[PDB]
Short mmCIF file of C-alpha atoms and ligand atoms in Angstrom, two decimals:
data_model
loop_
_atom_site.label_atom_id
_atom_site.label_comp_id
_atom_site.label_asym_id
_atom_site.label_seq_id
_atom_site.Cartn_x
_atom_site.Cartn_y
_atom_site.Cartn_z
CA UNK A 3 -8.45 84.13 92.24
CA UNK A 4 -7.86 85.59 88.45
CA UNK A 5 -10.06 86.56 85.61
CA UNK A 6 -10.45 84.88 83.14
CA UNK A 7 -8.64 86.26 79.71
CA UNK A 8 -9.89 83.42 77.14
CA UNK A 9 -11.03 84.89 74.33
CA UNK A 10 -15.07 84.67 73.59
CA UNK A 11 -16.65 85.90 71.07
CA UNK A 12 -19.63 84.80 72.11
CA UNK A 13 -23.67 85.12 70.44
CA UNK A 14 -22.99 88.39 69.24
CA UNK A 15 -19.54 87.95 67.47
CA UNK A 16 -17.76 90.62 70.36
CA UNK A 17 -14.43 91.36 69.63
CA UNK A 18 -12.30 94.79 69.57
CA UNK A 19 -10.81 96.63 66.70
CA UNK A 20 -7.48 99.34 67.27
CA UNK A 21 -6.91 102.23 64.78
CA UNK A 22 -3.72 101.91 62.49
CA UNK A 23 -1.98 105.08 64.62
CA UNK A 24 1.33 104.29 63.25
CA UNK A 25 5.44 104.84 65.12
CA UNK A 26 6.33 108.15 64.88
CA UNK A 27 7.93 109.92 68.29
CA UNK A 28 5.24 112.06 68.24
CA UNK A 29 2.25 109.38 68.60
CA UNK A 30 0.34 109.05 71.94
CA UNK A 31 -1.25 105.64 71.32
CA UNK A 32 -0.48 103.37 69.39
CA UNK A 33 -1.58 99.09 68.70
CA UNK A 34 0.36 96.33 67.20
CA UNK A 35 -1.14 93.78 65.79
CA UNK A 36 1.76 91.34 66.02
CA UNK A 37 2.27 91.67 69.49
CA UNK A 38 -1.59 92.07 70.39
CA UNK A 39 -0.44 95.34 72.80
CA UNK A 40 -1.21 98.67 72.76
CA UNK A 41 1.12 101.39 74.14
CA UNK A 42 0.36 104.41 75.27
CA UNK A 43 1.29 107.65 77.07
CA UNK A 44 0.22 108.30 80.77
CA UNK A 45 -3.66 109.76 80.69
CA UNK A 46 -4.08 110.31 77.27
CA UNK A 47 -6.87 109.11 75.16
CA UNK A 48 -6.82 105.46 73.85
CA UNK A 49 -9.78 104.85 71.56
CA UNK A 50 -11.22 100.96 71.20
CA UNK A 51 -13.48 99.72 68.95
CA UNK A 52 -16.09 97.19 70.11
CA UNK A 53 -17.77 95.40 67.10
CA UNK A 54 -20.51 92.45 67.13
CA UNK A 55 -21.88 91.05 63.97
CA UNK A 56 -25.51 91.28 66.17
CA UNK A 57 -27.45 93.80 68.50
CA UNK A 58 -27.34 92.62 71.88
CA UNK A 59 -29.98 93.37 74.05
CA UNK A 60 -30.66 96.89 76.09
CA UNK A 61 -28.78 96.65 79.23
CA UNK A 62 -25.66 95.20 77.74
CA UNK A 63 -22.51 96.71 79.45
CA UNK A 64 -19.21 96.62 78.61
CA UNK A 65 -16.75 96.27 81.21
CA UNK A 66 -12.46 96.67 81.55
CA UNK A 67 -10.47 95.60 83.78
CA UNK A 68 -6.38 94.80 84.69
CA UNK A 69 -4.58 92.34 85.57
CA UNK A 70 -1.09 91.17 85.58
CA UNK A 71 0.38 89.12 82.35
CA UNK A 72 2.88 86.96 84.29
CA UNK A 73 1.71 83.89 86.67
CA UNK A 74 3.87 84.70 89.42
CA UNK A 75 2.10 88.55 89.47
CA UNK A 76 -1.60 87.55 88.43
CA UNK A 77 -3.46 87.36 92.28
CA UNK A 78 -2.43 91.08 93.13
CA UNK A 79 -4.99 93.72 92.27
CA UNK A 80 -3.72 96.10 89.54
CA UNK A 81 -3.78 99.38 91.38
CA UNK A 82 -1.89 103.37 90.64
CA UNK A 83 1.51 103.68 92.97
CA UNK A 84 1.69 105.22 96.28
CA UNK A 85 2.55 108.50 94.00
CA UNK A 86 -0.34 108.32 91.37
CA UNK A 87 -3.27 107.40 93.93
CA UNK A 88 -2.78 110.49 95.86
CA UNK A 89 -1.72 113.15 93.24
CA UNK A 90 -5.77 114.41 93.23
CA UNK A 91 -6.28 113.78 89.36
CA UNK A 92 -9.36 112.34 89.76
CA UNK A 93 -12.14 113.37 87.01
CA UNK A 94 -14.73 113.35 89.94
CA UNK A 95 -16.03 109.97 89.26
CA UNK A 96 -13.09 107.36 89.01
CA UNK A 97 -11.87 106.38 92.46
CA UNK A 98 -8.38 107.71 92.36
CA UNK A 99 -7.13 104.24 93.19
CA UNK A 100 -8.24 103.02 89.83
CA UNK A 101 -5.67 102.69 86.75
CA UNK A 102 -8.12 102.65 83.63
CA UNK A 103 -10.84 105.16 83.49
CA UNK A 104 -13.08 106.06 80.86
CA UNK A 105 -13.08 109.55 79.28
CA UNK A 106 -15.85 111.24 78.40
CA UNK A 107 -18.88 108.84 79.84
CA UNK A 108 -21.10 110.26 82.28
CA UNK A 109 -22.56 106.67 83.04
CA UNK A 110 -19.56 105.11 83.67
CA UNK A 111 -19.38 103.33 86.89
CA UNK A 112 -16.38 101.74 88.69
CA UNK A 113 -16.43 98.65 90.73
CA UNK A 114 -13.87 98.05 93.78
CA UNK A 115 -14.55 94.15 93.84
CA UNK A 116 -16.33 93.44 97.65
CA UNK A 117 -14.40 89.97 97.10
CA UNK A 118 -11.79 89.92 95.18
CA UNK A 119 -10.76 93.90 95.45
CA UNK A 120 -9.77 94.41 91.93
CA UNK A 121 -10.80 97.63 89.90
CA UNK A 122 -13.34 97.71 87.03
CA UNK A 123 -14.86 100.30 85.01
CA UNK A 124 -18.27 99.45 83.36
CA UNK A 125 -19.89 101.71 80.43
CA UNK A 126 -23.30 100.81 78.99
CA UNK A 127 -22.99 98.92 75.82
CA UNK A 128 -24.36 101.66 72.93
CA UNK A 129 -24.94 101.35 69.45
CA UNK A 130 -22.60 102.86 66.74
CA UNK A 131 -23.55 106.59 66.03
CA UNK A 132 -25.50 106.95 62.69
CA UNK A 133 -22.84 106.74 59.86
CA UNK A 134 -20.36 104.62 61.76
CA UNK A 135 -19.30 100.80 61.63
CA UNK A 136 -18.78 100.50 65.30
CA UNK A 137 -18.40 102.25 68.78
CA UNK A 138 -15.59 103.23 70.35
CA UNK A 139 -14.60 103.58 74.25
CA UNK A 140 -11.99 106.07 75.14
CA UNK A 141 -9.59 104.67 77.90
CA UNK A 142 -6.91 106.59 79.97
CA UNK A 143 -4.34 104.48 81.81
CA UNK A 144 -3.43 106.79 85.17
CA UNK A 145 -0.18 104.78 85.74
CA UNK A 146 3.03 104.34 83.97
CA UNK A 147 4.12 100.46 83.55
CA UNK A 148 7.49 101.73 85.49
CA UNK A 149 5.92 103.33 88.51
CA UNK A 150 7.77 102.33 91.43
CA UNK A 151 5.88 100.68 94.36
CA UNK A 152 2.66 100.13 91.55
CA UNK A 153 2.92 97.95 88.16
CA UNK A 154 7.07 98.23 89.06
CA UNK A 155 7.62 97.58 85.05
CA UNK A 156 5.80 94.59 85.67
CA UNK A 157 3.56 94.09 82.04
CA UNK A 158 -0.21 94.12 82.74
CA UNK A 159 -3.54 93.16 80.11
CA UNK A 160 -6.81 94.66 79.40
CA UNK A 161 -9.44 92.33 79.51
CA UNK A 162 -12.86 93.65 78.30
CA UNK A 163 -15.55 91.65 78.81
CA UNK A 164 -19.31 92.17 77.64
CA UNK A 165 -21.90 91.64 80.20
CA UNK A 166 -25.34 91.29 80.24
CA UNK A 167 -27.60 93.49 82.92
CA UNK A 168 -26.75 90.85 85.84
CA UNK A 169 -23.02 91.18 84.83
CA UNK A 170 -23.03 87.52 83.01
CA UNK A 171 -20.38 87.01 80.57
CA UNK A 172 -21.53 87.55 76.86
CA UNK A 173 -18.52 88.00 75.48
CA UNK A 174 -14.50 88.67 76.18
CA UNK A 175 -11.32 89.91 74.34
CA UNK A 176 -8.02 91.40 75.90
CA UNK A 177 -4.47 93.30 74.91
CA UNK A 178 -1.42 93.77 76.55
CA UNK A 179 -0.86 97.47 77.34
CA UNK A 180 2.78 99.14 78.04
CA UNK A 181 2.17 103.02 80.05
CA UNK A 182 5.11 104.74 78.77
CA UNK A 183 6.58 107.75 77.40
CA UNK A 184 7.37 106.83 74.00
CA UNK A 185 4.74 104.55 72.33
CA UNK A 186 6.43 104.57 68.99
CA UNK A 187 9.66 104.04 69.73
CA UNK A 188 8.53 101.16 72.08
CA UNK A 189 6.37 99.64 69.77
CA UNK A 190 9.16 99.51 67.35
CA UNK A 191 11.74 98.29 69.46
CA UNK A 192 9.10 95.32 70.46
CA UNK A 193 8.17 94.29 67.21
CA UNK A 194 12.26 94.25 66.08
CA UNK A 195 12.31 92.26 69.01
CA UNK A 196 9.85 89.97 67.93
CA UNK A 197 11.57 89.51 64.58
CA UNK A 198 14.49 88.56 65.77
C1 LIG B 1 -20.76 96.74 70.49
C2 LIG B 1 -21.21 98.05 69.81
N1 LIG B 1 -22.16 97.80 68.76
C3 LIG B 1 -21.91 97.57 67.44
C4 LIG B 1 -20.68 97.49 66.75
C5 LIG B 1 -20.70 97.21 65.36
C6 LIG B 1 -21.92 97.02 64.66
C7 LIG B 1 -21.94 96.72 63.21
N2 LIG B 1 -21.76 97.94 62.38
C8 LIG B 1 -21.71 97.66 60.93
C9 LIG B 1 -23.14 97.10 65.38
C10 LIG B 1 -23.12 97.38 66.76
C11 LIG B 1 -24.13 97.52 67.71
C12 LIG B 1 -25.54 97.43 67.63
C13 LIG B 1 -26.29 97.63 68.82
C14 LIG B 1 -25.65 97.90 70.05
BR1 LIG B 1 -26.61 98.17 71.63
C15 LIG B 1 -24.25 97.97 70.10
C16 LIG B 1 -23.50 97.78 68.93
ZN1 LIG B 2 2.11 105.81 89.09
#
């Protein structure tokens, strides 16, 4: 089987919002808009914005998970390479199996599938600090989109999903997401691309 990746916005008005981090060499994340991908470097921080024009209800979780863009790809599980799942990284909660893991969450929890084996990582849904618009997850990806014997350069989506507490779909949104080492550059290149 495969996830779904239709976008929902669902009773609340879920969607996700991407700061404007710009091209330079030097950036470590980065979104564009026109190409609906974020790329990043390996582990580091990628900050998402969840917004909802209502409060859903206590218990609300907010869930992310991988999968592969292209047909032919989309029934294998999304996992690290032979390399990254046994180069003891792990933050002592993710399995070390998992690509995305959330930074900085002590409730985080991460699912290995009983059915379907694919990885998720599941946050509680909180409300935006006082003084902010919205709140923001921080993601690392723990693979590069080249690694050999893993993704293989083989393009892969976020798809986050809200849930309510018996993991029933509220709400969904998704991105494409290129692991590399030069975000700006790549976005550039892309979006030239894209143009022409
Ligand atoms: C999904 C995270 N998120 C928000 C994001 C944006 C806004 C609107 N701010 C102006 C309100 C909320 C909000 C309110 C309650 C809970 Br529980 C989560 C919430
Ligand atoms: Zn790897």
């Amino acid at each position: 089987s495969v996830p779904s990746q239709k976008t929902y916005q669902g009773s609340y008005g879920f969607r996700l919002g991407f700061l404007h981090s710009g091209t330079a060499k030097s950036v470590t994340c980065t979104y564009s808009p026109a190409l609906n991908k974020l790329f990043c470097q390996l582990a580091k921080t990628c900050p998402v914005q969840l917004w909802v024009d209502s409060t859903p209800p206590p218990g609300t979780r907010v869930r992310a998970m991988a999968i592969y863009k292209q047909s032919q790809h989309m029934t294998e599980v999304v996992r690290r390479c032979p390399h990254h799942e046994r180069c003891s990284d792990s933050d002592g909660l993710a399995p070390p199996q998992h690509l995305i893991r959330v930074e900085g969450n002590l409730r985080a929890e991460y699912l290995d599938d009983r059915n379907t084996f694919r990885h998720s990582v599941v946050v509680p849904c909180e409300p935006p600090e006082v003084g902010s618009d919205c709140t923001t997850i921080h993601y690392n990806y723990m693979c590069y989109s080249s690694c050999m014997g893993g993704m293989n350069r083989r393009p892969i989506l976020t798809i986050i999903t809200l849930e309510d507490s018996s993991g029933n779909l509220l709400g969904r949104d998704s991105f494409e997401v290129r692991v590399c080492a030069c975000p700006g550059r790549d976005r550039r290149t892309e979006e030239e691309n894209l143009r022409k």
